[PDB]
Amino acid sequence: ESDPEVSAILVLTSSEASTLERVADLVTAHALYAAHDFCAQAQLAAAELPSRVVARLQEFAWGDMNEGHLLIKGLPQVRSLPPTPTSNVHAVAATTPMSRYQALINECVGRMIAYEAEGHGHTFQDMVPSAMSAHSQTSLGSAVELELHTEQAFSPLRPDFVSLACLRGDPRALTYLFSARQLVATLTTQEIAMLREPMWTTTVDESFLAEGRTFLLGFERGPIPILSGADDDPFIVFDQDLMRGISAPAQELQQTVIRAYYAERVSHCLAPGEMLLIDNRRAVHGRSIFAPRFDGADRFLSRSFIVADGSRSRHARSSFGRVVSARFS
Numbered sequence: 001e002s003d004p005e006v007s008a009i010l011v012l013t014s015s016e017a018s019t020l021e022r023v024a025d026l027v028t029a030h031a032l033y034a035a036h037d038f039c040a041q042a043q044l045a046a047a048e049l050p051s052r053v054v055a056r057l058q059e060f061a062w063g064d065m066n067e068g069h070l071l072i073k074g075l076p077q078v079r080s081l082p083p084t085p086t087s088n089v090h091a092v093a094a095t096t097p098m099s100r101y102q103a104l105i106n107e108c109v110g111r112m113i114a115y116e117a118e119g120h121g122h123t124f125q126d127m128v129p130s131a132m133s134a135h136s137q138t139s140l141g142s143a144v145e146l147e148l149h150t151e152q153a154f155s156p157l158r159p160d161f162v163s164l165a166c167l168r169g170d171p172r173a174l175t176y177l178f179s180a181r182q183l184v185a186t187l188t189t190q191e192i193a194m195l196r197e198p199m200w201t202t203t204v205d206e207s208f209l210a211e212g213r214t215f216l217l218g219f220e221r222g223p224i225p226i227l228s229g230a231d232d233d234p235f236i237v238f239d240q241d242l243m244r245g246i247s248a249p250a251q252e253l254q255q256t257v258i259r260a261y262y263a264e265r266v267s268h269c270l271a272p273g274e275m276l277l278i279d280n281r282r283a284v285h286g287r288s289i290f291a292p293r294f295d296g297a298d299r300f301l302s303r304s305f306i307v308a309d310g311s312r313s314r315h316a317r318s319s320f321g322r323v324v325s326a327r328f329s
Contacts, residue, residue, distance in 0.1 A: 067281030083296030
């Protein structure tokens, strides 16, 4: 029954939540139609947040031994929440007061970014159940478990962080988290060395494909390792559906990672007023089966992405643009 610990939990006091609510009034631009102005206003207004909150976010952003995630509780209550949309085309979360609270916290950590090939390049995406993709390996699934993965395993432009703010929760929908440090603690020396070898080719996610769309990096990339970086602070790239072992031992090692994940993963049921930051280099994430009703009261998260460095994607964006063009993913 492992859950996110006190070190990986930031609880806002009533006073801190009130400051955050007032500071959100400094963020006035349209999140979808003036994304850069919106994000830059949030980055500047974030200087007005409580110092204790800013300190925890900057520590998490630095990354060194950060646990892989940070759960924030006590965000100001979403009071006039519209019904949960049945698809992600409406971008309902992007005009809620939560989008401003989420942007302020995000912009303490790093620069918000979006991807043309992911949820229409929306600054905030509605993470809601899809009746079509219910049995699919996507953030809109429900009837099947969302398998352990890092976000955009195939892409060098993958986000540094995934930001999930909860508008409506579902009691059966558990978010699973598993860090590269937790993984390495269960493995033998030989398994760690092998995961550090470039033995996995990676393929572009099927949802990124489109008629007449060509990727500069091609459809199949690598081979790449699963583990990299410092021995005591390893980075992870993992996705069974998009990473193919170049040999039978390479395929067996992904099974080793999956078993360690089922044995050691921590869980948390996201509730309204909560926000989860996942370090996409240090942890993998998943989600349990749940049973949505598609009745306007379903689980509803606002998803956004963060990168430490916006210059890394400049070649893939327009001037004062926050959207990475699909061909560069």
